[PDB]
Copies of this chain bind each other. A is one copy, B any other.
């Protein structure tokens, strides 16, 4: 339980906020890790019976892993660019907003790369090399994202909502 991922998200979120109210001073630290809580959003739609097939549960699980990873990686770039390199006395920092980091990640991971925004610190360049090499060719380059996409198309129905006043009939055997 202690080294469970959702437990790690609490250890990097909760104590800093006690320090912040004790010192009466906010700190814009690793709080973005709260975005990693979106991964289990499939459980909410499944418990509320909004989400149907196991196939659609797999699709929403994959889609939420993409959004939460995108918002997390944008948080790491945000932190690492707004604070300089320490060997540079923190002087080479860059005033990227969080939304410029979200945009930079999208323009990079689509491989467009305009270079209107890019990481300038040495740490930011190390993180972008990691996010390019891990984001392509490991995190993307799945195969089940197409098998589940066509698996959503094969399914001929579930229940026949029988409407009142209409007569009804069932046909079976060799139907072709």
The interface of chain A, by Cβ under 8 A from chain B, is: 99, 103, 106-108, 110-116, 118, 120, 122, 125, 129, 132-133, 136
Contacts and interface: CB of A to CB of B under 8 A. Distances in A.
Contact of A111 (B99, B112, B122): B112
Each complex incorporates copies of this chain amounting to 2
Interface of A is mostly: helix
Contact of A113 (B99, B112, B129, B136): B112
Contacts of A103: 125, 129
A113 B107 contact: yes
Given A103-B125, A125-B103, A111 B111 contact: yes
Contact of A136 (B110, B120, B132): B110
Nearest to A109: B112
